[PDB]
Design an enzyme around this catalytic site. Structure first.
Site, short mmCIF file in Angstrom:
data_model
loop_
_atom_site.label_atom_id
_atom_site.label_comp_id
_atom_site.label_asym_id
_atom_site.label_seq_id
_atom_site.Cartn_x
_atom_site.Cartn_y
_atom_site.Cartn_z
N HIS D 13 39.83 52.09 40.95
CA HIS D 13 40.58 53.01 40.08
C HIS D 13 39.60 53.68 39.14
O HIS D 13 38.70 53.01 38.62
CB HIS D 13 41.66 52.22 39.32
N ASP D 15 39.52 54.64 36.02
CA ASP D 15 39.30 53.97 34.74
C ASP D 15 38.47 52.68 34.90
O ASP D 15 37.56 52.42 34.11
CB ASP D 15 40.62 53.70 34.02
N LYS D 16 38.76 51.89 35.93
CA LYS D 16 37.99 50.67 36.20
C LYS D 16 36.57 50.94 36.67
O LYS D 16 35.66 50.17 36.38
CB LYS D 16 38.74 49.73 37.17
N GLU D 41 29.81 54.07 26.73
CA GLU D 41 31.04 54.63 27.25
C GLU D 41 30.73 55.41 28.51
O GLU D 41 29.72 56.11 28.58
CB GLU D 41 31.66 55.62 26.26
N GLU D 54 25.17 54.48 22.42
CA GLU D 54 23.97 54.07 21.69
C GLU D 54 23.58 52.68 22.08
O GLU D 54 24.44 51.83 22.28
CB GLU D 54 24.27 54.07 20.18
N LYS D 152 46.48 50.10 43.29
CA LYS D 152 47.24 49.71 42.12
C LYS D 152 48.34 48.77 42.59
O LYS D 152 48.87 48.95 43.68
CB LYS D 152 47.85 50.98 41.52
N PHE D 222 47.22 58.46 50.68
CA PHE D 222 46.29 58.13 49.60
C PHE D 222 44.90 58.13 50.26
O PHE D 222 44.30 57.09 50.45
CB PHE D 222 46.63 56.73 49.07
N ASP D 230 40.74 63.83 39.60
CA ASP D 230 41.25 62.95 38.56
C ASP D 230 40.21 62.81 37.45
O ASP D 230 39.24 63.59 37.41
CB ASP D 230 41.59 61.60 39.18
N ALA D 231 40.42 61.86 36.54
CA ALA D 231 39.37 61.50 35.58
C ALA D 231 39.58 60.05 35.16
O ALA D 231 40.72 59.56 35.18
CB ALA D 231 39.39 62.41 34.35
N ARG D 236 40.40 52.36 28.99
CA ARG D 236 41.73 52.96 29.13
C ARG D 236 42.68 52.10 29.97
O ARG D 236 43.75 52.58 30.39
CB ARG D 236 41.60 54.37 29.73
N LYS D 237 42.30 50.84 30.18
CA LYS D 237 43.18 49.89 30.87
C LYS D 237 43.28 48.59 30.08
O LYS D 237 43.17 47.49 30.63
CB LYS D 237 42.66 49.64 32.29
N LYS D 257 30.57 46.95 25.48
CA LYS D 257 30.29 46.41 24.15
C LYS D 257 29.57 45.07 24.22
O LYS D 257 30.03 44.15 24.92
CB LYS D 257 31.58 46.24 23.33
N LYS D 261 30.39 42.73 18.95
CA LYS D 261 31.61 43.47 18.69
C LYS D 261 32.77 42.50 18.65
O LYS D 261 33.10 41.89 19.67
CB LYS D 261 31.84 44.56 19.74
N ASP D 263 35.93 42.95 18.39
CA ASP D 263 37.00 43.35 19.31
C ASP D 263 36.93 42.61 20.64
O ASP D 263 37.97 42.33 21.26
CB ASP D 263 36.89 44.84 19.64
#
Ligand code: NA
Lengths: 369, 369, 375, 374
Positions: D13, D15-16, D41, D54, D152, D222, D230-231, D236-237, D257, D261, D263
């Site tokens: 996917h 995002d993955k 990122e 960075e 998915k 598919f 797409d992007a 984002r998951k 990260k 971090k 988070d």
């Protein structure tokens, strides 16, 4: 009666920014790995730099530091604020460089029109652009900014340079500068007249030169702002100003014949003229697939020879080794010497000492004749 | 003496960029003939970056630029990762924002029907044909990237021998270089071109023919490489035979004197030769800031004139209007005609009708003389 | 004893720059073609913006003008100088958006929340954090503290006892500013006076004890550069800031850069709208509403209410009334909230829910009367 | 009656793809410099990757090799052809990462565990991840060689009074070669090799799957996938990465990260605490909350919500956690041994409840400690 115009641009012109970034990357790689193969292209447009191409190198640390090399070069050029249109510290930098015998004819040229044995229009244009930068960097005219362009028109009668016809100097500057009261006289005094005094041309009549400083008015923003630049888009500026005779130089290591053979031919031509063998000369070298040494080496002296051209060719064959590996060896090309070549011309430089500009073969040619 | 010139197919990464730049120019001109365009293209592995500045009312065309880019790449023939590049799936990034002292040159010579120097004329004929036999399926295993090189041997300025022809072409991996590629290229490309040209005196009987001298050529284009707009100026013009006033053509609307005045000078030179006024001619035009019409129009006939050079110059003055606005008007330049110019040369084209290649001033020059 | 912390960021935070760019592109397209399909992602890093994705639209002029829309949004945010770290007029902008002209449902579970903790029916920590980030921007833009710069962050920690908000425990306000500003003599008192104290007076919480709040203004010190400078941001990376500040569950999916046909956005909005009206109707003090959708059916297959013991009516009766009063088919949500309009750029900072500065369709208390009469 | 749906996506996917590139870069840097500061990122769209952010690192060779790491990751994912929509060997790659050499926060983070599955994860997400992992597995192992990387999974479970009674719906969408008959080939193959094998693996003692509604590629063909048309972006998951919507989130994405971090490392520590609490038999389900204050290393609060399923006083559970766990961030990094190249595998199929790889925050190594302290 003939008019000839050539131009030069400062290191702040967006095309020259790209040439310098390309050659700065080349230099950084060669400093750590003299064997590096480099073919690096640079693009600039509003707020961003894109550096792409291919390298083969063991200089992994230098490769890692390319993004920093890029920013440092832009700051050295003098782009350090959005107020100037571009800032090396805050602009976008994207790197997309991958890392993992030929038929040809090349030319070189020299002419006894200036001390540096270059045609007069391009020689004066480069002297002017270099001085324009120098007066900014040394604090002589501290309101100047990096972008600029010079144009020189010389009037000729029967191939003799008789008049300095027109000089155009366009320069970026701070917004509050009075173009008539300040920029015009300062540029005439600190750039044009200083250069003319340096050159001390024995016969050129500059008494009625038309001088145009920023003829299009204010030049506050510059460089990539509202524009774009690319590596290798100022070939005529880099060479002979259109006076003499493909392939751009910057971002290419010396294994690229487009660069090293062009350099070699300039070196030959310059030493031939300096040996007094001709007033002007175009040297051509022909290469064939499957032969290291040239299959042809031809001289055109335009009727100005002091020896038979065939003897000049014989002397060149005896004195020079024009195999690519020998050129690189003899001109000591495997060194980080390229960033300075990326503005103000590759040929006829009076401010830096370049291997292909040395008159180190004059006596050899004389003895060989 | 030996003279070599080169041409590349529309698949060469630099030519991909010229074509993309001029395809964007054409799309904007088609909808807004008054568009101001300065569009540069970069390509490297898997990506296109199109940048620059436009002034246009053609907003719909501007919006569709990304689609224009992909369509051009597919027409060039890059339609698979197996070929190294695919217009349908590659990255496309668009970063386009939305007189003068000068000397430009043009040249013509009665060496070929198209009045171009022989080495470049033959190189362009060969590269066009190489593309033609691929696209029509005559040699269906061919891929887009390719290069042609022609070396002609001269004796006292007469082209006496076809010395060497190099044809390098991309192809599918399964092709036998010796049993298939070599004879196919010889028969379908080189021999057909030579027969097309039918040079009355050139000796082709001992030509050294090299097809893919460096071996297999499976991937090509931007793959493992990079290209930029305006990096094939010598290919675009006279193949090194005649000097260039500098400046690349592609991506620039006709208001850019680097493009239109160079076209105008080719047009003048070609008409002078076709009118029998000389065998070969370089025409030079000098412009000054503040004057619409040239301050100088000079002819060099290399001893081949059939009328006094000053009389030729006089006739050119009467026949041609070389104000920038008049050149644009007379050559009908405000039209989408530029994409085809972006490969196979801007000058001497047989396959397309270009305004600056028309012999529509021959009679006027003959009457004015 | 319990502590709860939520944060908000200004429109100058690099992730929020991307959200705003993405929804500014969305808005420009919707303005000229209300049926535009839009999935636009924005990246920022030092000196550059990268806008990518896919659009189906007839709004070709708007699409052509995207680069101008990008630069204008960055200048509105306040980045107009390299001295601030970023400049909309001079930064790199690259567009990699696929474009075409025009011409079933999904398995899903989406959540909405409301609580009578604040006037805007939001949890107290996120409500206060958003009021603070919004006021921080306001005092810069209106010239009250003109030395402020765009980037900033607020954090609010509330102490709870037996679910009652008893103490304002900690407020952290970090803000970008001009280099010459005295942190202790100028910034700290100015921020306390013009941002923190005004917000507390606006909220006028009847019972919250703010008498011993620990207040930290720029705890890490100087904050001269900001935004993308020496950093990076992406669309859809502040989802908890955009919603309930971690107080309530998320059914996943970011909002910005997505047209209303994306159920992740429009159904989350519909559920907020439902929850807010349920609470305003006095049916519960707090509520989570869940909607379940099945592939092949437009209307929900499930509509569930969780009142956490605070109901004043049988939860089954609340569910029944919601079923009668609301049409939660995606098409109906779009029509009834009037979502095919350029209303999204303002949502891209300061939260999508509980907004006290702008009127959003899903925040309207226009279904209270319907629910009371239906039950 | 309640329905709960969670989803998972494969490593293909878009995002993955980004999460994995970001963590592959992190790993490469950590391998040579364990102290590297990393905030990387990734963006993907048609034919291109853009990696930004960075780094502070001494791992200069690893930094130089980032482009190769990107391409290798894309190829391992399985995008090796324009015919699949994306090719790691030929796609565009741009690096815009700032690079340097070396020279308190108010917060509330959550962790969760529940005795609903062997992995102590909520059933909907656990089954969704099991399905997406198996979908990838049958492609990579050649069982269904016509599969392509993107896909998915969605799982809807029906609940009655908190008990998972029925597997309501399973949706599996997968990229595939163009020639494949969706209804006659893909549908039965997926039922057999993916869904049924997963259900057999799980062997749920009570979940009734007898009338599950199974939808294989309900939206049709598919053929192309990943970034094509797409992007994707890193981070984002987040709900897929964690608990599938079942349990709360205190904000922030994981991938790209370094462990400094909070988070990331604190979210990991909270899962670790929560998992050990349930495995210690102290509750059937638990949300653990940690509160941090600026200027203090140790938490200023540690709270447990057992939802009425506790076997010991919640306050006693909180006391036990206090004695057993050192939740200072430096201690978390030391005790979980986080300064190692372990992150790339976390970037698909979930960070929590992994049955295919061993993660430090999934270890039941504090169960004995908790029982002794309680
Ligand atoms: Na069923």
């Amino acid at each position: 009666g003939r008019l000839f115009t050539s131009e030069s641009v400062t290191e702040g012109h967006p095309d020259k920014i790209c040439d310098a970034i390309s050659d700065s990357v080349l230099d950084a790689l060669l400093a750590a790995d003299p064997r590096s193969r480099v073919a690096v292209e640079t693009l600039v447009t509003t707020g961003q730099v894109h550096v792409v191409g291919e390298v083969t190198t063991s200089a992994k640390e230098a490769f890692a530091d390319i993004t920093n090399t890029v920013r440092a070069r832009i700051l050295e050029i003098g782009y350090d604020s959005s107020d100037k249109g571009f800032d090396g510290a805050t602009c976008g930098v994207n790197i997309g460089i991958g890392a993992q015998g030929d038929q040809g004819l090349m030319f070189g040229y020299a002419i006894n029109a200036t001390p540096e044995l270059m045609p007069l229009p391009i020689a004066l244009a480069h002297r002017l652009s270099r001085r324009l930068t120098e007066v900014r960097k040394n604090g002589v005219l501290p309101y100047l900014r990096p972008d600029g362009k010079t144009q020189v028109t010389i009037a000729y009668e029967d191939n003799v340079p008789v008049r300095l016809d027109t000089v155009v100097i366009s320069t970026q500057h701070a917004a509050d500068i009075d173009l008539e009261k300040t920029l015009d006289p300062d540029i005439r005094e600190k750039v044009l007249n200083t250069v003319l005094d340096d050159l001390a041309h024995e016969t050129l009549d500059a008494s009625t030169v038309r001088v145009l400083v920023n003829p299009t008015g204010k030049f506050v923003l510059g460089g990539p702002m509202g524009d774009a630049g690319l590596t290798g888009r100022k070939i005529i500026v880099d060479t002979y100003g259109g006076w003499a005779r493909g392939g751009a130089f910057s971002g290419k290591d010396p294994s690229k014949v487009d660069r090293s053979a062009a350099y070699a031919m300039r070196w030959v031509a310059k030493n031939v003229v300096a040996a007094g063998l001709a007033e002007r000369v175009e040297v051509q070298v022909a290469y064939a697939i499957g032969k290291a040494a040239p299959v042809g080496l031809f001289v055109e002296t335009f009727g100005t020879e002091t020896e038979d051209p065939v003897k000049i060719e014989k002397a060149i064959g005896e004195v020079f080794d024009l195999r690519p590996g020998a050129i690189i060896r003899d001109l000591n090309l495997l060194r980080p010497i390229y960033a300075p070549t990326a503005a103000y011309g590759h040929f006829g430089r009076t401010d830096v000492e370049l291997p292909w500009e040395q008159l180190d073969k004059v006596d050899d040619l004389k003895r060989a004749i």
